[PDB]
Amino acid sequence: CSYTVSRPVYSELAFQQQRERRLPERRTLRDSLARSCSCSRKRAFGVVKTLLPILDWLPKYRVKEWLLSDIISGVSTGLVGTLQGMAYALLAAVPVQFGLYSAFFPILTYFVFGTSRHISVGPFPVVSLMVGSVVLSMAPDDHFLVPSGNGSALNSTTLDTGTRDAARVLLASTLTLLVGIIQLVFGGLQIGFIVRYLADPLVGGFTTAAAFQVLVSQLKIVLNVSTKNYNGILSIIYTLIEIFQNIGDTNIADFIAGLLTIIVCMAVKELNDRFKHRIPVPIPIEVIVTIIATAISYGANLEKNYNAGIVKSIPSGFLPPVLPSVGLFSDMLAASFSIAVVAYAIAVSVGKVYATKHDYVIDGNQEFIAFGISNVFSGFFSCFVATTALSRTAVQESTGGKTQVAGLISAVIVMVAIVALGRLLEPLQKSVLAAVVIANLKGMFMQVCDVPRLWKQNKTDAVIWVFTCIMSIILGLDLGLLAGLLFALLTVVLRVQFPSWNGLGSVPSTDIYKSITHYKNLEEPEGVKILRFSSPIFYGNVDGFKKCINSTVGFDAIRVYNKRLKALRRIQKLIKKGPKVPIHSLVLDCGAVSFLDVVGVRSLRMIVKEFQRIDVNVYFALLQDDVLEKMEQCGFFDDNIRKDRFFLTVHDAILHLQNQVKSRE
Amino acid sequence: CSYTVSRPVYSELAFQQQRERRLPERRTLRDSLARSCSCSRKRAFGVVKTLLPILDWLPKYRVKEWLLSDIISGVSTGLVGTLQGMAYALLAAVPVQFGLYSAFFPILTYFVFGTSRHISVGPFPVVSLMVGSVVLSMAPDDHFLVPSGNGSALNSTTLDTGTRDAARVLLASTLTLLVGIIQLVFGGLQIGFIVRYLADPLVGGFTTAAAFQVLVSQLKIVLNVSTKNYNGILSIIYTLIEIFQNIGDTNIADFIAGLLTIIVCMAVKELNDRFKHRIPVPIPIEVIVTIIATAISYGANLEKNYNAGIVKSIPSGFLPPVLPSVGLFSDMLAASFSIAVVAYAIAVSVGKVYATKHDYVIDGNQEFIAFGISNVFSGFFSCFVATTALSRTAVQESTGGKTQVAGLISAVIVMVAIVALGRLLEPLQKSVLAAVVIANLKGMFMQVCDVPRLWKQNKTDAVIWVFTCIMSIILGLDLGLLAGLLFALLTVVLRVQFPSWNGLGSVPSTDIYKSITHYKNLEEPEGVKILRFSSPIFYGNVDGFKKCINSTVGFDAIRVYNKRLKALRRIQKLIKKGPKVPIHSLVLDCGAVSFLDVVGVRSLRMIVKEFQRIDVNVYFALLQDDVLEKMEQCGFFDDNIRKDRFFLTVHDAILHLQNQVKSRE
C-alpha cells in the first residue's frame, strides 16, 4: 500500500554509535580442531552410512514389483551395455574382450559405493576416444612392428599383433589406475568445486568436438583405411585428409553394411522417439541389428569371400589380475586429469538429470569416491575408464529402473557373455560395431542447433561454446578442455574488469534512483552527480574506474589541478611586478562491491584526495559492512577522510548535501 | 535533518508503466564506421600532436631558466648513465662497449616520441637480466669453444672469445626488435589494458625476487668463479650451490675490491638520503668511486701482478648498423613477451611517480609507441632493451630537470664517452662495475618489509606477493611473471566464486537493512528471511548459491519435496485400505549483481520453481536495470514467474508481504 518512513540521516557514525555490534567468533584453533573430530558413535554411523550408500536402499526394498522391474531392465541394459562395450573397445585400440571386462567390474564396484539409482556405469564414447588417443600417443603402431617374413627387397616389417595389443592394454590399465587415484584424491580432500568451472556451453562444445572426432575415427574404422594415427595439432583435419586421399583403399562390403546399419538404426531410433506413447519399452534395435549382422555374416563367409573385417579374436574367458605398470604417470598426468574431469562432469550431469526426473538427489563427493574406487578396481582387471552413457542409462530408465540391483542383474548378462556365449560373435563385422556409436552420436550433434539460441541470450556464453568447440578441434581434445576452462575464467575476469557503469539520477517526488541512460524524465540535483560502479574495484579495473569518473564528471581531476597551478604563477608574479564549474559533489553509489583489493582502496583514497584539491567532495552511498571493515584495516580512515564521508543510502547523501548547501552558503 | 518519503510500493511494473524509457542508440554499422573516420583537418592535427609530443614542449620552452638546469643535470646523469650502461652490460652477457650504445641511441629516439620529462631511458638491472637469460640459453659457452692449442692429453678446447661474444650481440639485437614490435602492437592496436593485470604486489614480488637473481649473478663476477650457466627450474638455486663449492677458485684482489666499493657506495647513499636538506645536488658517489678505482688499477698493474679481472676490450668507436638476424623469433615468443611487459610496467610506474610530483600527467598508449620505436631503433645499432632506472632518473630529477633536453645533453656525455674518452676505463676492474649494481639493489630489497603490512591488510593480496616472489625463483624469472598473472587472476575468480553472504535483517522503526552477523539488536519479519548475495552468479558460484539458500532457511528445497511425496503415499493408500514451518517467504537481496551468465540464471528459475512446490515465495529486492534486461532475453519471465515477483527496494518486498498476509489470511 503506502511506503512511508521517517528517520534521521544516519551517514556512517550516527548509525554506528547507538547500534552495538556482535562479538566475533573466537578462533580457538585447539578447540576448533577438538570440536571438529567427534567422539560419539552417531558421527561414525553417519559417515559409514554416507560412505556406503548400499546400507540405505537395500534394507528398504520393495521387492513385490521392483524385483521383476529390475530383472527386465537389467536384462535389457545388460544387452545394451555389452553391445556398447564391444563397440567402444575399438575406440581404445584394445581388443574386444576388454570392453566386456570394463562392462562387468565397474558395475559390480558401483553397487556398495554408488549413490545413484538410474546410472549404468560402463564405457563412454568420449572417454574411450581420449583413452585411445593417449594410448596411440604413448604407444604407436610404428613402435612394435618386427622385421620378419622374407620380403621382396627389404625386410618384411609387417604388423606385429600380439605383444602390441598387450602393451596397449597395460598402458590403458595404468591410465585407469591414475584416473582412479586422482578421483579418490579429489573425493578424500573434499575438493568438489574444481568441476564447477565446467559450464554448460563449455561441456556442450567439448561434447560436440568429441562427437566430431568420434565420427572421424569410426569412419576410419568403417572404411577400413590404414591411417598413420596423427596426433597433436590439427590431428582431426590431418586424419580426415589422409582418409580422403586413401578412399580407393576401402572395402565395398563393409561400407555398404555400415551404411545399411546406420540408416536402419537412425530410422528405428527416430520412429521410437516419435511414437513414444505407442509402446513404453523401447525396442532393442542395436541387439536385433547385431544379431542379424552376425547371422548374415556367419552363413556367407565374408571373411574369405569378400575379405571383410571381423573380430575372430574373442578368447571367451576371464583373466587373472595384473599389477599396473607404475612409472608412466609422468607422461599421463594431464591426460588422466582431463579424462577424470570430463568423466565426472558427464556422470554428474546424467545423474542429476535422472534424479530430478525421479525425485531424488545424489551427492558429489560420494560419486567421486565411487568412481575412483570403480576405476581402481577396473585397473586391476585390464579395463578402461568407466562412466555412464546417456544412451545406455536411458534404456534402463525407460524399461523401468528403481535401484542399482538392475545393474547387478545386468552384470549377470555380461557374465554369461564372458564365460559361455561370445564365441558366436566371431564373424561379427567390425564396421557394424563402429556404426552403433555413430547412430548414438545424434544426441550430441544436435547441440549445434543451440548456438543461435545462446546468441540471443548472453553473448559472452555463446562465444565460450564456439571457442571450446573450435579449440578442442585444433589442438587435440585433451588440451581443448584446459583451453576452455581458462578461456571461461578469462571471460569472467573481463566481465568484472569492464563493468556497466551508469548515470544514476533521481525520480521526482520519490527516494529511488534509476539510471539516466534508461529513463527519460529524470532530473539530477544541482551540482551533484551520482555514479554507480558494479564489479568491485580491484587491481585491474582501477584505470577503468578512473576513466569512468573522468567521463561522468566531464573533466579530469589531474588536468584541472595542472591548469590551476599553471594559472597561479601568473598571479604570484603580478604582486612583485608592480572547467570545474558545474561539478559540486560526487556521490559514488558503490553498492555492487564485494571486495576492494587494497591496491584499489589506495586509488580510492587518491581520488578522494585529488577531488578535494579542486573543491569537489566525493561521497559514498551504499558501501557494505564487509567492505568498510576491510577499509578500516587497510589504512583508509585517516585524520582527513573520516566516516562522515560515507553514507548508508543514496538519498541520505543527497539530503545531507542539500542541508549543507542550504545551511552553509 | 529529516528523511521522510511517501510513495506507493512499486515492485517492478507499477514503476515501469508510467516511466517511459529511452530509445536505444541504433547500431548503424555503415554510419558508425563512417563517423569514426573524421575528415576535418583538426582531427589530423590532433593525431599528429600526440604521436610526436615534442611539438608541444619544444616550441613552448623556457630557456630563461630551464636551459641552465638542463646542462648541469645532463652532465650529472650523463656520468652516472655511462657507468650504469656499461655495468648492466655484464648482466646481458654482451661486451661492455655495447652497453654505452644502449645509453645513447634510445635517448635520441625518446626525444621526439617520448611523452615524459623526468625519465632517463636506458638500461635496467632487472630487464638486462632477462635479456641475458635468453642469450645464455640460445648461445651458451659450451656451444662456441673450438679445440685448438695442443693440450696435454686431449684437444685443447679452451675458450673461444671473439666470434663467441660477437654471436651474443646478434642474438641480443634480435630480441630487442621483437620486444619493440610487441610494444608497437599494443600501441598500434590501442590495447593497453594488458598491463593492468600487473598488480602492485605482483610487480613488487617480481622485482624483489629478481633482485635476488641479480645478486647471485653479480656475485659470480665479484668472486670471479666460472659457472655452468644453469637455466630452467631452480636455476638460481643451482648456481648458488656451484659458487659455494668453488669458493677456493676466487680472486682475492677482485674480492677486496668489490667488498670495499659495496660498503662505500652504500654508506654514502644512505648518508646522502639522511642529510638531504644539507646539499640539494646529490654527490655522484658512483662516479667518484670508479675514477679512484681506475687510478689505483692503472698505477699498479693488477692485471699482471695480482691477475685481476679488467675490461681491456673497449674499441672506443662506433659501428655500422647491422640488420637483425630474423628467424629466431620462434624460440623467443614467451621470452620477448615477458620482457616487453615488464619494460612498460616499470617505465609507467617510475614515470607516474615523478609526474604527480611535478604536476603533470603522461599518456599511457604513447609510452608504447615511445618505447616501441626506441627499442626498434636501438636494435639496428646493437643495443639491448631500453627502460628507465629508478636510481638513474632520481639523479636527473634531484639535480633539477625540466624536460628531456637534459636527457639529450646527457647523450652528449655518452657521445664523448665513445669517440674520445673510454680508453681510460681500460684497467677498470669488472668487480667494481659488478658492485655498483648491487649497491642499488637496496631499494628493491627493502620491499620485503612490506609483506607484514600487506598481511594486516587484505590477505589475498599478501599471498600474491609471496607466490610471485617464490615462483619467480623456482621456475626461472620469465615464467614467474606468467605464473603470477594467472595466480592473480585466479584469486579474482576465487573472490567472486565464494562471496560473503549475510543474514540481512530489519532495524527497528526504520527502512534500512543490515547484516544479522554484525549487529545485535536486529529483528526479522515473522516468517520472512532476507538473504544478500554479492559476487554476481555465474557458472562457478551457482552451486554455492544453492548451498547459501539452504543454509539460511535451515532445510533443502529438494529434500523437503522428497519427504513430502514419500509421506503422501501413506495417505493415498489409506483411502483404499479401509521442516518448512517457519519459512514463509524468501527475499533475495541481489543488489551486488552485475552480470547473470545465463548458464547460472537457469538455477534462479529453478530455485523459484523448487520453493514454489513447498509453498515458499522467492522474491527479489535490488535487481538492477542492466540485469533485468538480461532475464527478458534469456527466457525468464514466463507465464508463472512474472515481474511482480521482483521489487525495487528491500523494504518494498517486506511491505508487500505484510500487506498481503493482513489482507489475505
Residue numbers in the entry:
A (entry chain A), B (entry chain B): 18 to 595, 651 to 737
Paper text:
Pendrin (SLC26A4) is an anion exchanger expressed in the apical membranes of selected epithelia. Encoded by the gene SLC26A4, pendrin belongs to the solute carrier 26 (SLC26) family. Pendrin ablation causes Pendred syndrome, a genetic disorder associated with sensorineural hearing loss, hypothyroid goiter, and reduced blood pressure.
Similarly, the pendrin sample in the anion pair of Cl−/I− (1:3) (pendrin-Cl/I) was prepared and used for structure determination. Symmetric inward-open and asymmetric homodimers were observed with approximate percentage of 75 and 25%, respectively. After superimposing all structures we resolved, we found very little difference among inward-open structures or among outward-open structures, respectively, with root mean squared deviation (RMSD) no more than 0.5 Å. The symmetric inward-open conformation most likely represents the energetically favorite state, existing in the single binding-anion condition, Cl− for instance.
